[PDB]
Copies of this chain bind each other. A is one copy, B any other.
Amino acid sequence: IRVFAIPPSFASIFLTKSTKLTCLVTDLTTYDSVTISWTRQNGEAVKTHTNISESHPNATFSAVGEASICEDDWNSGERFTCTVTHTDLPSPLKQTISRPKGVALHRPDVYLLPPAREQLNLRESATITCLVTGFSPADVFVQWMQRGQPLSPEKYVTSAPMPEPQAPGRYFAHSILTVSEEEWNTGETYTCVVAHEALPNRVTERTVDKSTGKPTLYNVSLVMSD
């Protein structure tokens, strides 16, 4: 019986606006004799909602329990222990998780790149790049919004954090968005929202527009009619 209880990820916490735990238990034969419950250091019982998934092809069943806990408990590093009881287990299987301390925190620097002109000449599609670098540790959520309305999660692809070459400890990642030529030429404004723990306000935003950085042009005419 494989009993796993992953910690709540930062991205999931920011997306769902709540703290939910999960004790994934697999390799189960009988799903009618399972019980999943979490507790604190003192021993107070925590209301845990257990759900039963489908039957795995290897004749094994899954038991998932989820509970809602106030961010303060997890943020404080309070240890959460999962309780698993089954008829095939002579003793219950329990695991303890907490927060790893001594973690470096550096606010990420966000850079937004506009589409190359040579690409626009083909009249096919434009690509806007949102670079996020110098963040610690690897927990970053990148979201693209247009005119204050979030976009669908299909139009952009977000990479995974990778170590920086010159600076150990610093990570970096970047995502791209694909838009049609006419929408870009119309004059729409796009924004890149980045969510990180080390940020003072936890949220920073960068915007891009067709008319951004265009230098002043000069049109001089001379007659010199002696």
**Chain A residues packing against B (C-beta within 8 Å):** 18, 70-73, 107, 109, 111-113, 116-119, 125, 127, 129, 131, 133, 145, 148, 150, 154-157, 159, 162-166, 172, 174, 176, 178, 193, 195, 200-203, 205, 213-226
Contact = CB atoms under 8 A, between A and B. Distances in A.
Contacts of A202: 203
A112 B116 CA distance: 8
Given A129-B129, A220-B218, A225-B225, A117 B157 contact: no
A74 B193 CA distance: 28
Given A165-B155, A223-B221, A113 B116 contact: yes
Nearest to A195: B201
Nearest to A125: B166
B219 A219 contact: yes
A46 to B, nearest CB: 14
Copy tally for this chain in the complex stands at 3
5 contacts: A129-B131, A129-B174, A193-B201, A219-B219, A226-B226
B111 A113 contact: no
A221 B218 CA distance: 11
Contacts of A200: 145, 150
Contact of A216 (B131, B154, B155, B218): B218
B165 A162 contact: no
A159 B159 contact: yes
A191 to B, nearest CB: 10
A110 to B, nearest CB: 10
Contacts of A116: 111-113, 131
